Amino acid sequence: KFPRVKNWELGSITYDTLCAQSQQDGPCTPRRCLGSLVLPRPAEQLLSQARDFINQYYSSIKRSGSQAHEERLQEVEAEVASTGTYHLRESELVFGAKQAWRNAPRCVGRIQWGKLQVFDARDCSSAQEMFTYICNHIKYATNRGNLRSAITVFPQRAPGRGDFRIWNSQLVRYAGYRQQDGSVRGDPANVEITELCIQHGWTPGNGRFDVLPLLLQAPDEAPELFVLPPELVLEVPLEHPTLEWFAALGLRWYALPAVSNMLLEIGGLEFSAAPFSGWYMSTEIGTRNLCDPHRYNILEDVAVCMDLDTRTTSSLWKDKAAVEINLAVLHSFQLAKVTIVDHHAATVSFMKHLDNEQKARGGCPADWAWIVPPISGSLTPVFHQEMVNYILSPAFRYQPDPW
Amino acid sequence: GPKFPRVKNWELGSITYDTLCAQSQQDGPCTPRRCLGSLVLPRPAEQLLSQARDFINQYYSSIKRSGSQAHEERLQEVEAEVASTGTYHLRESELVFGAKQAWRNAPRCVGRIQWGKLQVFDARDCSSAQEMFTYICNHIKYATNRGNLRSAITVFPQRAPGRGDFRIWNSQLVRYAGYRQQDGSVRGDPANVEITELCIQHGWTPGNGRFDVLPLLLQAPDEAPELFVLPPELVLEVPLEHPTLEWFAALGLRWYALPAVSNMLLEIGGLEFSAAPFSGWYMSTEIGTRNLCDPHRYNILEDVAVCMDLDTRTTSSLWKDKAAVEINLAVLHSFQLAKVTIVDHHAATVSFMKHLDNEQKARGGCPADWAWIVPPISGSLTPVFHQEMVNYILSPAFRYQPDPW
Numbered sequence: 001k002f003p004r005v006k007n008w009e010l011g012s013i014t015y016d017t018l019c020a021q022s023q024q025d026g027p028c029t030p031r032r033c034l035g036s037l038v039l040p041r042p043a044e045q046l047l048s049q050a051r052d053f054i055n056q057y058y059s060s061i062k063r064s065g066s067q068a069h070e071e072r073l074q075e076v077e078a079e080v081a082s083t084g085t086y087h088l089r090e091s092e093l094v095f096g097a098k099q100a101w102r103n104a105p106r107c108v109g110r111i112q113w114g115k116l117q118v119f120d121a122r123d124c125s126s127a128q129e130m131f132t133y134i135c136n137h138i139k140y141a142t143n144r145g146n147l148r149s150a151i152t153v154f155p156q157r158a159p160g161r162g163d164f165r166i167w168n169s170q171l172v173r174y175a176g177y178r179q180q181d182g183s184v185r186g187d188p189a190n191v192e193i194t195e196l197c198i199q200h201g202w203t204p205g206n207g208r209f210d211v212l213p214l215l216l217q218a219p220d221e222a223p224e225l226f227v228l229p230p231e232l233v234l235e236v237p238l239e240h241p242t243l244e245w246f247a248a249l250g251l252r253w254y255a256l257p258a259v260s261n262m263l264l265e266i267g268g269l270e271f272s273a274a275p276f277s278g279w280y281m282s283t284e285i286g287t288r289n290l291c292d293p294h295r296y297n298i299l300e301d302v303a304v305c306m307d308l309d310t311r312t313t314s315s316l317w318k319d320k321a322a323v324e325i326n327l328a329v330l331h332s333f334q335l336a337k338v339t340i341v342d343h344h345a346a347t348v349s350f351m352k353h354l355d356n357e358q359k360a361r362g363g364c365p366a367d368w369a370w371i372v373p374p375i376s377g378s379l380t381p382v383f384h385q386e387m388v389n390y391i392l393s394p395a396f397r398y399q400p401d402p403w
Numbered sequence: 404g405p406k407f408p409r410v411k412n413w414e415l416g417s418i419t420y421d422t423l424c425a426q427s428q429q430d431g432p433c434t435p436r437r438c439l440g441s442l443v444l445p446r447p448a449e450q451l452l453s454q455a456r457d458f459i460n461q462y463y464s465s466i467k468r469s470g471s472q473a474h475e476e477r478l479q480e481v482e483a484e485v486a487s488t489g490t491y492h493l494r495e496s497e498l499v500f501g502a503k504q505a506w507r508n509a510p511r512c513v514g515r516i517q518w519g520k521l522q523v524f525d526a527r528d529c530s531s532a533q534e535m536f537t538y539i540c541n542h543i544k545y546a547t548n549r550g551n552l553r554s555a556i557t558v559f560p561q562r563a564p565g566r567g568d569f570r571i572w573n574s575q576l577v578r579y580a581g582y583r584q585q586d587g588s589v590r591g592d593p594a595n596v597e598i599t600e601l602c603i604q605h606g607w608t609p610g611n612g613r614f615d616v617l618p619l620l621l622q623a624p625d626e627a628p629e630l631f632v633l634p635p636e637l638v639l640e641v642p643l644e645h646p647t648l649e650w651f652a653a654l655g656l657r658w659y660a661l662p663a664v665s666n667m668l669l670e671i672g673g674l675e676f677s678a679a680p681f682s683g684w685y686m687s688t689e690i691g692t693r694n695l696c697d698p699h700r701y702n703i704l705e706d707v708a709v710c711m712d713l714d715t716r717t718t719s720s721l722w723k724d725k726a727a728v729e730i731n732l733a734v735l736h737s738f739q740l741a742k743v744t745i746v747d748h749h750a751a752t753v754s755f756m757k758h759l760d761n762e763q764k765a766r767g768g769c770p771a772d773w774a775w776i777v778p779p780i781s782g783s784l785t786p787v788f789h790q791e792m793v794n795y796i797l798s799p800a801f802r803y804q805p806d807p808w
């Protein structure tokens with residue numbers, strides 16, 4: 001029943017009892033494990049999720065069983081029975097957004113989970129208003145380089161109508177221009193959204209790092225285009241501490257990682273637009289975004305500049321170039337005084353987080369493949385830590401693209 | 404599409420469906436409620452016969468004589484034997500097939516493109532610890548082949564009805580001693596502190612170096628294990644140096660040529676071969692990243708970083724990553740110089756991708772454990788990081804077995 005969880009570096013063992021609180025099945029069965037897959041393939045039920053969430057909330061404020069708790073359960077029940085749905089109080093929304101983050105198995109930054117600014121944007125009625133709230137978020141979160149975690153929550157999905165959606169996958173994305181000869185200029189991850197923006201009327205540039213406009217959608221309307229004011233998108237030019245030519249690569253990344261296409265589920269209610277942001281771990285930029293062969297793919301270029309023997313894998317040219325690029329990212333963010341965390345510091349804080357959650361809740365859902373960094377895995381303590389992965393609610397969830 | 408798991412490569416965009424998993428007859432540790440894929444060790448008569456029939460069907464399929472008269476006579480032969488003895492025995496060619504298939508089936512092995520090239524030594528006539536030692540030395544000589552390594556397994560008698568097992572007590576044929584110190588630190592390999600102490604309890608005179616090769620504790624049915632020293636000339640080792648950092652050689656680090664697992668159970672058609680040591684060649688990260696840099700192994704990162712004059716006082720200098728790369732390069736360079744077979748993690752993962760394609764066509768899938776397949780440095784720089792994998796247990800199989808003591 002309750003899995004034993006061992007750390008193989010220290011020999012310490014815990015038991016996950018928190019997983020018993022899971023109500024949603026993942027993709028694994030006793031016949032086969034699907035844990036490396038990136039994606040998975042009525043009133044009575046809303047009422048149970050609603051009730052369980054309100055119980056979660058009153059328990060957190062230590063008022064479990066109180067008058068307030070009972071009356072609030074009655075409101076929820078009365079509202080659902082009459083209308084087939086309900087609405088959260090602001091404080092409940094705040095609690096549920098933090099819990100969704102806390103519950104996120106793929107997030108290595110969860111030590112921070114209790115520190116989240118929640119902007120309530122549920123009184124939004126147009127793409128125009130969405131834009132204003134998004135700019136306020138960016139400005140707040142960016143804070144001239146001293147980044148602060150934030151979420152803005154737009155109106156929940158409703159039975160009658162279409163969703164509020166932000167089409168872009170992040171608030172900040174560089175264009176990817178598909179070229180005649182089949183290559184890509186810019187970020188190949190963003191080809192499709194770049195073509196959408198143009199098709200909806202954007203005048204495209206032709207750089208490797210052109211910031212995309214937002215396509216914002218109010219219910220049952222065509223999305224609208226909105227150019228972010230350049231002054232709101234903080235960027236960091238990349239340079240290397242000792243390698244002078246590196247700056248000459250013209251590389252850069254944006255300060256603010258802000259995910260904008262995930263669904264936030266709290267107590268059975270769904271928030272189809274609820275962008276959220278923290279600060280980056282350097283390997284996201286230095287390893288994945290710049291070195292993935294299907295991303296900016298700069299490994300070779302960097303290795304030649306370093307004059308490495310590129311002819312053979314056993315010279316470890318890829319490994320050496322990747323280290324330097326990661327170093328350049330850390331250096332430059334430090335130089336520009338913009339919050340960043342390296343993969344060693346981040347995984348150490350995650351280990352402290354596991355221990356906190358063990359005491360607090362008796363476990364912590366974690367996806368080992370996503371937690372362990374993409375370079376130097378076993379040099380970080382999380383590589384040696386067993387982890388149990390399961391879905392708790394409140395949750396952030398993947399949702400299909402709106403087009 | 405199909406009612407089998409969809410498997411995607413996020414680098415290339417390509418998709419397959421694993422149909423092979425339908426052949427799995429044994430449950431792993433995961434359920435719909437929670438994934439336990441990251442756990443290292445998760446916790447007959449009519450049963451034997453059904454496993455035997457399945458294995459014999461597998462054998463006859465592989466030789467394309469499925470449904471044939473020889474196929475039906477063999478099945479009858481197996482149940483007759485089980486009917487009268489409670490057990491049965493494999494033909495030589497059945498053993499060779501099952502051993503290769505146990506390797507092909509191993510989800511944690513990245514080297515499986517080589518699975519068809521395994522020399523299977525049949526040692527099922529062995530009846531003493533002394534003879535086990537001879538067989539093991541022959542295995543070591545054949546497999547080592549003066550640095551031109553050749554994959555091999557040697558198979559000792561199977562488990563039998565309430566008669567004791569053949570066991571090799573050591574986890575590998577080559578292991579460096581780990582000596583517990585008066586201050587609680589370890590000299591040598593901390594992985595091997597228990598077996599080192601077991602060797603001394605059984606009469607071994609200990610050394611005091613960081614790289615003392617252990618003797619073997621070999622157990623024949625119903626006897627106490629006996630101790631055997633490997634002739635030093637049989638254990639090929641590689642002194643580590645670095646191609647440009649001249650001081651690395653002065654560190655006195657080394658590793659042995661032959662990775663030879665000796666404590667796993669080989670299961671074929673319900674038969675259990677408790678002693679069946681097998682060996683291949685190393686992927687360089689196993690030595691240079693894990694064995695040398697794990698904090699709970701030789702733990703050399705800080706020493707190397709100090710020699711490289713790195714800033715070890717702050718995580719963000721990436722001193723750990725820089726030192727680990729150089730140590731891996733030293734491992735590769737030293738083995739190449741010594742002419743001892745080794746494969747780096749780029750070339751190994753690339754060959755594992757080819758393996759996956761071959762197996763897609765041949766069997767409809769390939770059981771693979773993503774956390775074990777992805778190397779412990781430079782993970783996402785290798786093509787396997789971007790490749791989804793389905794993990795499931797097929798038989799024949801290599802299985803972990805409890806330590807004999």
Ligand code: HEM
Nearest residue numbers: 101104106107108109112149150276277278279280281396
């Ligand atoms: C405070 C700084 C934070 C750091 C350093 C951090 C770290 C990370 C990293 C490295 C990833 C993997 C990203 C990738 O591989 O593409 C990630 C994923 C994720 N994080 Fe965080 N995180 C932070 C804050 C947040 C916040 C504020 C939230 C939401 C309130 C959040 C929720 C998530 C979710 C839901 C994922 C998985 C996304 C997916 O499945 O696509 N994180 N985190």
Ligand code: HEM
Nearest residue numbers: 506509511512513514517554555681682683684685686801
């Ligand atoms: C030919 C060269 C080979 C290479 C490069 C190779 C590579 C590897 C690596 C890197 C591991 C993970 C070890 C660790 O992290 O400690 C492994 C595990 C494994 N390999 Fe191979 N392998 C090779 C040959 C073999 C052979 C000949 C067999 C058996 C016939 C084999 C069966 C296994 C098994 C059963 C495991 C899992 C061990 C466990 O769970 O403890 N491999 N392999």
Ligand SMILES: Cc1cc(N)nc(CCCCCCCc2cc(C)cc(N)n2)c1
Nearest residue numbers: 038039257259276277278279280281398
């Ligand atoms: C198909 C698919 C599914 C899925 N769940 N996720 C993805 C892409 C994941 C992109 C997330 C990248 C943003 C990560 C992030 C978010 C935050 C808030 C902080 C931080 N340091 N990093 C694709």
Ligand SMILES: Cc1cc(N)nc(CCCCCCCc2cc(C)cc(N)n2)c1
Nearest residue numbers: 444662663664681682683684685686803
């Ligand atoms: C507790 C535990 C369980 C388990 N299944 N496995 C382990 C790890 C044992 C380490 C296995 C070392 C395999 C080394 C090897 C073996 C072969 C044949 C080739 C090659 N390159 N490497 C521990």
Ligand SMILES: C[C@H](O)[C@H](O)[C@H]1CNc2nc(N)[nH]c(=O)c2N1
Nearest residue numbers: 036037038369370788789790791
């Ligand atoms: C196939 C595999 O699951 C996939 O490549 C995962 C591996 N681990 C990851 N880990 C993080 N943090 N982010 C990722 O995108 C991925 N990709």
Ligand SMILES: C[C@H](O)[C@H](O)[C@H]1CNc2nc(N)[nH]c(=O)c2N1
Nearest residue numbers: 383384385386441442443774775
């Ligand atoms: C907890 C975790 O499963 C454990 O540290 C695993 C991770 N991946 C591994 N991968 C390989 N090849 N070898 C290992 O010993 C491990 N250890």
Ligand SMILES: [Zn+2]
Nearest residue numbers: 028033433438
């Ligand atoms: Zn699983």
